Symmetry: C2
Subunit: 100 residues, 2 copies
């Protein structure tokens, strides 16, 4: 009645780099206008490896979703208390594979 399998999926990953909350919002909006086919309502993994601790995750989360991007999970997290904040929302942490 129920079967558990592994599978490869090709997901879009938004690599965030250290910047002011308003600069991030602006950059995301500009990218959605530039690439509407790829980014309008896009389900995405958020890569936070380019961010510097401490990350204000409730704020960043609200900025990303405010743009319509649907956050699948978060990759590149090393910081322990950033992990706690991500789990509090119940978002998966994910491990990336080869570029696709």
């Amino acid at each position: 009645p129920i079967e558990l399998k592994g599978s490869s999926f090709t997901l879009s990953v938004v690599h965030l780099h250290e910047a002011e909350p308003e600069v991030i919002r602006q950059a995301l909006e500009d990218k959605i206008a530039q690439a509407p086919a790829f980014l309008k309502h896009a389900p995405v993994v958020i890569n936070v490896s380019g961010l510097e601790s401490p990350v204000n995750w409730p704020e960043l989360h609200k900025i990303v979703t405010s743009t319509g991007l649907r956050i699948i999970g978060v990759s590149g997290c090393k910081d322990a208390s950033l992990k706690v904040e991500i789990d509090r929302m119940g978002l998966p942490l994910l491990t990336e594979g080869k570029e696709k």
Copy 2:
């Protein structure tokens, strides 16, 4: 400030087969007890290709999440009104790749 990339992820996929709502719940619980490491709170893609139209998605959704599985997206959907019901929740439809 922001970079868009493609990447491969290996996600767990729960292949659902046509069965009574209560039989599905039972099977999911048994699988969580059998394989707790792989399935307790597991983020998962739900494959509905083994299901027969019409699917009662609000009901099935509530049964799957009731067990603690976190639904990443849904794969194998062909039925058009099942797609509508899935989008109403804002869940991504996903395309599977090679077994991993």
